[PDB]
Chains A and B, each alone.
Chain A
Amino acid sequence: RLGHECLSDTVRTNFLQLLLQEDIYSRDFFSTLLRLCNAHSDNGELYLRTVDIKIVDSILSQNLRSGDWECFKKLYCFRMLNKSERAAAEVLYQYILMQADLDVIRKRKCYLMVINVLSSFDSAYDQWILNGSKVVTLTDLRDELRGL
């Protein structure tokens, strides 16, 4: 956190990538960061710098390209706690579409999560989420939930 004249973003990118590929460090380290993210999310603040946020974003996005629901579960948790909450709805939403590994009951459960998170918002721009350039409304998701 306190680099930026004692750590360069590129050297830091490499570290962050390293401990998350090595099984032994990845879990304990990453749960630890997210507990601490929770302590400043409660405030309506951040715990982290802008640079660190994007590094983690980038590694996890590359873990989506290896599949599994769990990769999205990490990206989700990170975005909720480090305040990217419209994008957090998006993360759960990508999963239902990208995967045909999910069954019909399983598609429904996922839909139900996105729908209640959109409508809990105190913002009128977070009542919908983006898939490409088309705006996806609760109404659209609802049609999807009965049709899937």
Chain B
Amino acid sequence: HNELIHDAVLDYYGKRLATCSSDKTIKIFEVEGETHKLIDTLTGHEGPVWRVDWAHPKFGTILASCSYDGKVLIWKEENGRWSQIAVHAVHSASVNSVQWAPHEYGPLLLVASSDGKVSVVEFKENGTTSPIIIDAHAIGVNSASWAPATIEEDGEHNGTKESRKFVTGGADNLVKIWKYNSDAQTYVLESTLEGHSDWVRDVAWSPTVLLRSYLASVSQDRTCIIWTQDNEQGPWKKTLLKEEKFPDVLWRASWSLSGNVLALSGGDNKVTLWKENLEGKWEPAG
């Protein structure tokens, strides 16, 4: 239907809107400004479609949808519609998050299911899934993320190296920081951070151009602690966004693709807006 959509995301080129329903359909529309005319509907899940994500065009516009069933159903526009080219279901139930990764880490998908797993789905020539699974949390993983420590993605003055940090949101009430070492094939648990005594809903990574990285750990205590990294290997410090508890029942928490402004997607269908002011402090903006 259109009587309950759980996520919507837009491709880079601005051609297909991909709304995901909870009766098991991914209704795919046409971006024509603000007008939208339908072009597909894909039923294939056995659980409510939780989330959908787009992939950077340099490795195709790939549409990864996940339900509560232990299935991630990858589609890709082929056959004059949207047709699978991969599938990944190494979990059993409650796949929550599914986020694509930049090509400075290669073409990987970063899957979070609530069964205390996270897979790192590497993609090869034939479009093959290669889940390199890891146990994290123990009550559930809601979400997943990573970047350099010593250097960065290869360029001019960012070296190259081989490492990838993570943020994993859990339903154990923690938000763990895992660290990949591509020089050892080790996933080393590094830091465990706890800001909430209620489930960490969403986690996210700041795409800020700043060396500091901020992580917005939202919760059902209606509190967001901002986990402040001084650099790319510095400590983490709990900080308050709103100094009081939001009226917004917080689920998601996304930073802008230009700016460092944070929107918290309230159950009231209002987005409160908190960004740092001329004093150095998270204060209102909407």
Residues of A within 8 A of B (CB): 137, 139-140, 143
Contacts and interface: CB of A to CB of B under 8 A. Distances in A.
What DSSP secondary structure best describes chain A's contact surface? helix
Interface in B49-80: 79-80
Contacts of A137: 79
A143 B79 CA distance: 8
8 contacts: A137-B79, A139-B79, A139-B83, A140-B79, A140-B80, A143-B79, A143-B80, A143-B81
A148 B63 CA distance: 29
For chain B, what secondary structure do more than half of its interface residues adopt (helix, strand, loop), or is it mixed?
A: loop
Pick the 5 closest A-B CB pairs, nearest first.
A139-B79, A143-B80, A143-B79, A140-B79, A140-B80
Interface string B80-116: 1101000000000000000000000000000000000
A132 to B, nearest CB: 15
A139 B80 CA distance: 10
Contacts of B80: 140, 143
A113 B80 CA distance: 22
A137 B81 CA distance: 14
B85 to A, nearest CB: 13
Contacts of B81: 143
Given A140-B80, A143-B80, A143-B81, 5 more contacts: A137-B79, A139-B79, A139-B83, A140-B79, A143-B79
A77 B81 CA distance: 35
